[PDB]
Design a protein around this ligand. Sequence first.
Ligand SMILES: Nc1nc2c(ncn2[C@@H]2O[C@H](COP(=O)(O)OP(=O)(O)NP(=O)(O)O)[C@@H](O)[C@H]2O)c(=O)[nH]1
Ligand SMILES: [Mg+2]
Length: 166
Amino acid sequence: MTEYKLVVVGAGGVGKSALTIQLIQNHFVDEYKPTIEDSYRKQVVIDGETCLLDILDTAGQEEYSAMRDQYMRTGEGFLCVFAINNTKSFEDIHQYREQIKRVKDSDDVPMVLVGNKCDLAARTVESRQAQDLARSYGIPYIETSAKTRQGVEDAFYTLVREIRQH
Ligand SMILES: Nc1nc2c(ncn2[C@@H]2O[C@H](COP(=O)(O)OP(=O)(O)NP(=O)(O)O)[C@@H](O)[C@H]2O)c(=O)[nH]1
Ligand SMILES: [Mg+2]
C-alpha cells in the first residue's frame, strides 16, 4: 500500500507528540515527556485509499539538530507545529521551514502550518497572523487541540492530500 512519510517538527513543548498520540492512540498525553525521536506506523483509510502513515515525531531541542537533518531528508510531508500561547514558537517556525527547504533542496515541500493548543484561552498568536504566514508560504494553516482532538485528523489528512497533489 501507499505509504506517506510525515514528519512532525517544531519548537520544544508545542505538542508535536501530543498531536501524534491523539491521532494514533486517541488519548491526550498530559505529561512532561520530551522526545528524542519517535516513529509511529498506522494503517488508515483516507478518502477511500488504504494507506500507511509513517509518522516521525521529532525533538524540539537544539541538541538534536543533526538527527534533524536525517529525519527531514526522508520526509515527504511536514507538520510545522507551534503553540498559540507561545510567540517564540511561532517565530521559530520560520527556521524550521528554512531547514526543511535546505535538506529537501526544494522551495515547495508538502507542508501544513499547525497552530496547536487552541483550547487555551491565553492566546498570544492571533489566527490572522498565522494565516498570513501560511499564505505567504503557499501552505494551509490548520488550528488544532491535542487536548480536545479538534483539527487533529484535519492536520494529518490535509498533509496527506498535499502529498498526493505534489
Ligand atoms: N492545553 C493543551 N496542552 C497541550 C496540547 N498539546 C500538548 N499539550 C501539553 O503541552 C506539553 C508538551 O506537549 P508534548 O506533546 O510533549 O510537546 P512536544 O512538542 O512533543 N515536546 P518535545 O519537543 O520536547 O518532544 C504537555 O504537557 C502536553 O500535555 C494542547 O493541544 N492543549
Ligand atoms: Mg515530543
